[PDB]
């Protein structure tokens, strides 16, 4: 695997809060911006290794980036680079966040100080509450996407079964603004069959969980944008079977990857 960066995994190493990599950021304004509302972009220093996989993040509604920003540095220090978004709008809906997240993927492609650090082949959305349910219309709408994770994600749209992008759906128990029941789940239910996905729920956790560091989604986020953006075997162990995780109150995954 050329893709693989960084030590073995461990526990500790997908759940600590800095990764082996250090990160430095650049911003994109709304101006510089075309098609989303500007963002911030977290990137590793270290070129010796190679390229890195590209990862958009986007907030939810009324939402700015500082509801997700804790995100972008913790992801990227393990070997990514992450850009938090603004949207076009605040009230913009879960079909537009999509578009926002491919225009800000797409950005990174151009972006001067990140495009040569960049592997364009290898990216992923994420994204909270409508954010998520960004994400998914995003991968429903580009089939090249290599993971998506919808974080407590909203849509009104259930059926997902046109997403070809494996997809990690972090639900939050005690979720009210989004309940899992009429969204995560269901999401994770109309996702095809015979796609690598898998469901998580947080134990006891409510719709905001995303907006605070969570070293669970965090960690789980890692392992799902190292399999599946580095295509990266040593992280499938953290995903197949359920984690051994008092955190999370329910698992279902279309382990063995």
Known sequence: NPYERGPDPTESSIEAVRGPFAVAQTTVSRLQADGFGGGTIYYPTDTSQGT???????????????????????????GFVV?????????????SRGRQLQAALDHLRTNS????????????????????????????????????????????????????????????????????????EAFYNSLPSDLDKAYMELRGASHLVS???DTTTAKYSIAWLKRFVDDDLRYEQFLCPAPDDFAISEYRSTCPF
């Open 211 to 213: 907006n605070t560091p």
């Open 52 to 78: 890195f996989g590209a990862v958009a993040i986007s907030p939810g509604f009324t939402a700015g980036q500082e509801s997700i920003a804790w995100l972008g540095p913790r992801i990227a220090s393990q």
């Open 113 to 184: 100080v990140v495009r040569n650090r960049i592997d364009p082949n290898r990216m992923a959305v994420m994204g909270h509450s409508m954010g998520g349910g960004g994400a998914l219309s995003a991968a429903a709408n580009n089939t090249s996407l290599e993971a998506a994770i919808p974080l407590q994600g909203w849509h009104t749209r259930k059926n997902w079964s046109s997403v070809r992008t494996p997809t990690l759906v972090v639900g939050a128990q005690l979720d009210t603004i989004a309940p899992v029941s009429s969204h995560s």
């Open 83 to 95: 850009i938090t978004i603004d949207t076009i709008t605040r009230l913009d809906q879960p079909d």
